[PDB]
Amino acid sequence: GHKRGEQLFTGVVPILVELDGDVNGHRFSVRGEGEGDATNGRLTLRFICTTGRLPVPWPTLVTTLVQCFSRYPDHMRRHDFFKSAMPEGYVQERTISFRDDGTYRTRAVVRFEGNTLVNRIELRGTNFREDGNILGHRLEYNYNSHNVYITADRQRNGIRANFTIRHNVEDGSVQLANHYQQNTPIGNGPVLLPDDHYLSTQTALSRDPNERRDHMVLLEFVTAAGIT
Ligand SMILES: [Cu+2]
């Protein structure tokens, strides 16, 4: 499926993100729109909290809110699981453990709906501290560069990823978010299962001065590396 998969991403692809979330019994929804340019490994997205203020810091949802837009160099094309699963797409599941705080469990469907790449997510957050960094909104509105370590999950016919996000805290400390990720294709067609490699992920967060709703503007650059 990789030949057709690659062809789906050679241009600029519209993106829709829909997240329904419940954190410590606080229900919220996020809607995101923008576009992806996999050739350049570039995402540009605008996210709105449609339900009110986000009950958690925007930066904590970045990983949850489309690794099919990663730039896989030609010499790594046989290691691109994400595109090879398209258009039928994949299920992306995570446990995100915040050190000394609560846990997110996420399930997402990532697939084409017509010419749009859609990320539809359910998130459940449990055991957050009422006056921790997360529910207290003491995380800086910024984002560090990270490596996403990818390994094949042959039994699942998919991939696993492990990485730790470092969230800057307003007091100059760091909040760690331990990410456990698994991806499973939805379709029956063949997918590429990769050799061990990583996604070099860079994220810039900004605000829209014209927007009254709680929101996040995101630019992301993602390149596959670690195979010579
Ligand atoms: Cu293929």
Author numbering: 0 to 64, 66 to 228
Text from the published report:
As a proof of principle, we first tested the GHK tag on crystals of sffrGFP6, which is a surface-modified GFP variant that passes nuclear pore complexes 100-fold faster than standard eGFP. The engineered Cu-GHK-GFP fusion protein crystallized readily using diverse precipitants including ammonium sulfate and 2-methyl-2,4-pentanediol (MPD), and data were collected from these two crystal forms. In fact, for crystal form I in space group P6522 the structure could be easily solved using a minimal complete data set for this space group with only 30° of data, which prompted us to further investigate the phasing limits of single GHK-Cu sites. This structure was refined to 1.68 Å resolution and shows a square-pyramidal coordination of copper(II) ions: in the equatorial plane by the glycine amino N atom, the amide N atom of the glycine–histidine peptide bond and the N atom of the histidine side chain. At a wavelength of 1.34 Å (9.25 keV) the anomalous scattering from native S atoms is 0.428 e, which is much weaker than the more typical S-SAD data-collection energies (Cu Kα, 8.18 keV, 1.5418 Å, 0.56 e or 6 keV, 2.066 Å, 0.95 e; Weiss, 2017). Despite being able to automatically build the GHK-Cu-GFP structure solely from the copper(II) site phases, we compared the mean phase error improvement after LLG completion of anomalous scatterers with S atoms using the Phaser SAD pipeline. The differences in the mean phase error against resolution for refined Cu-atom sites, as well as sulfur LLG completion, before and after density modification with Parrot, are shown in Fig. 2(a) and resulted in an average phase-quality improvement of 5°. Here, the peak heights for the bound Cu atoms are 50σ and 70σ, respectively, while the heights of protein S atoms and ordered sulfates are in the range 5.6–9.4σ.
Here, the high-affinity copper(II)-binding tripeptide GHK was fused to the N-terminus of a GFP variant and an MBP-FG peptide fusion. The GHK tag promoted crystallization, with various residues (His, Asp, His/Pro) from symmetry molecules completing the copper(II) square-pyramidal coordination sphere. Rapid structure determination by copper SAD phasing could be achieved, even at a very low Bijvoet ratio or after significant radiation damage. We further show that an N-terminally fused GHK peptide can be utilized in standard crystallographic methods to enhance the crystallization of proteins and to provide reliable phasing sites for structure solution with minimal effort.
